[PDB]
């Protein structure tokens, strides 16, 4: 239906201010898929619309990350992470770049979302009104073309589970990180021009694809609060979990932050916006000398997964997963090489357990990071 | 069963010399396992009888690696390194310290050997005369009691294929090391005193594992050729396969060594005296974490999680490989200061797959990775 807010950045157009902003409000029981810097971006401000995606065997996965971020226009415009994996274990991950990012809310209550190259290239998405379903459309000239969808199927709606406060919301202050569609099935077809050594794949997901749609927003720049994070979407037997969880710069004394969400078959049994010193996690780094089965990652940070722990708060007992890095996705440096070299690595990760007495399997979709920062 | 040779040193008692001493000359188709300084050792020698074992699925292994070298006269006692590991994961494993070293040679051909404290506890061994059996007598008060058999049953004999020249009894010039039991049949019945915590324990391995018998010496002291070294002895199905690989330290500039044998049903076709840049070669690759998911890695700087071990045939394309990766920790003890750098070594139940190109046999190994702080 008819736009009825809008928000359109172009880069030859004013669309970046050297100094800070403040975001708009956030808003209780609302998913806030509305832009938060809607007329300009900062030299620091940073939105992310996210939509990943992976088969329930691991085999595919395919993930999309929506910026607009002052790090991306420096780079060339506001820019999109793609990445692919297929049951060979070629890869195919690139950062494209596009001169208009346009976000509206239409008088039926959906959001739409294009990001859009002089050439006609494009990445579109739609958001169902009540949060239920979202779906993209991969237009990008000799890069990727096809569909993406994710439908929520919960009996407890979206909106029932959605943050009602900043603290339900935030990493930390003045950082929003959230998952406001929960658990989703998830399809895929696209193709891809270029994949390996040569020659276009096609990827498939059929909806019984696993993965999560993330929203996220700050004034504050990654540095700033963060120096290694670890972001994971996982269905695990009957559990469905999300999690960010950062590890702080010297910039606010190294401490560390998460937001993390479960679910059991569609009802959430779990939130926590707190690290172990809602309720709590604890995420522990396993190293290869303790753990015989799970890659490492090629740069400093040389652990094999983790160990994810929700703790509830008015209660002893609490769930326990094991992560153990499965496939690798995509693997880049953020610094120069060397012993002490930081990178980022996706992951298709095995993950296991559940409450005491249970031993669920399945996988996950996610990345860790680290950045050179002290 | 009278003896004929007899070498017997008490570190207790002045049988080190500051200065180096040179060994007898090797002996060719010979085993060699009368000592080679047998009257005095220097502070560089040494002299090692090794033998080990592990069950067919390697849920158990025990080993005893029996030394004469002046390491230990600050302990009284010239070393017998024993280690132990259960299927539960529990691991016992100690330097055991004896002041006497005593090996003879019968006049019928068979090997004692006698490694005797002050308050009357000993290891044994005897090895027939054909090098075809050896057995070993653990009678050590509050640490182990028992005994462990290795047995060859090969068609080709022990002796048809035992180096005939120095070059193939060599790591390197004066460093000998050498396999001379080949493949062989292992059982063990054994007792440990106090394992975990303060209890005692019983140990059985029976006729129907696996092994492997070591005896090496040199003149050289460690540091002067290696810093890093691995060693291992496996099973993999009808693959016997057992090496040490040595990477140099700067006064080799770093040259990388190995010995290696490979038998296919119990016939020798591989041996391997040279590294990839005489008869065959090997390369021996580590593994790292970011390539293999599967295998754990030691407790120090080394962070491999296995390795690659190639045998190339000189004349042609056809060569084996295997894969190992660690399955099980057996010891870790540190070398160095703790540290980023810090060095140590790691026993392991290493997992092992392979064969010839296109072949996926998998079996078990024992064996073990040492680095030294030496530049």
Request: net charge negative.
């Amino acid at each position: 239906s008819e736009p009825t807010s809008s928000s359109s950045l172009d880069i030859t157009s004013n669309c970046i201010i050297e100094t800070p902003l403040q975001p708009s409000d956030f808003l209780p029981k609302s998913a806030n898929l509305f832009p938060k810097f809607p007329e300009r971006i900062s030299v620091d401000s940073w939105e992310l619309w996210e939509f990943d995606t992976f088969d329930t065997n691991g085999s595919v996965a395919f993930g999309c990350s929506l910026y607009r971020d002052a790090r991306g226009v420096e780079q060339g415009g506001f820019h999109a992470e793609v990445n692919a994996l297929w049951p060979d274990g070629t890869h195919w991950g690139e950062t494209l770049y596009f001169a208009v990012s346009e976000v509206v809310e239409n008088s039926d209550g959906t959001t739409g979302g294009k990001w859009l190259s002089k050439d006609g290239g494009s990445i579109t998405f739609h958001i169902a009104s009540d949060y239920t379903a979202a779906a993209l459309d991969f237009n990008v000239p000799g890069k990727v073309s096809g569909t993406m969808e994710l439908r929520n199927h919960a009996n407890v709606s979206p909106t029932s589970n959605l943050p009602a406060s900043d603290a339900e919301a935030q990493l930390c202050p003045g950082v929003y990180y959230t998952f406001p569609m929960g658990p989703v099935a998830t399809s895929v077809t696209a193709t891809f021009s270029s994949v390996g050594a040569n020659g276009e794949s096609r990827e498939l997901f059929i909806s019984s694809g696993y993965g999560g749609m993330v929203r996220g927003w700050s004034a504050r720049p990654w540095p700033t609060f963060m120096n290694d994070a670890y972001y994971v979407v996982a269905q695990v037997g009957p559990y469905m979990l999300q999690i960010l969880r950062t590890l702080g710069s010297v910039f606010v004394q190294h401490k560390p932050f998460a937001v993390a969400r479960l679910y059991l078959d569609g009802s959430l049994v779990s939130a926590a916006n707190t690290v172990v010193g809602g309720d709590a996690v604890r995420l522990t780094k396993v190293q290869p000398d303790e753990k015989s089965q799970g890659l490492s990652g090629k740069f400093r940070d040389g652990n094999v997964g983790y160990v994810l722990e929700f703790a509830k708060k008015d209660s002893e007992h609490g769930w326990t997963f094991q992560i153990s890095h499965k496939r690798a996705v995509w693997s880049e440096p953020t610094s120069a090489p060397g012993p002490d070299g930081t990178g980022k690595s996706g992951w298709i990760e095995a993950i296991s357990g559940g409450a005491k007495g249970e031993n669920y399997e399945g996988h996950g979709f996610g990345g860790q990071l680290q950045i050179p920062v002290p």
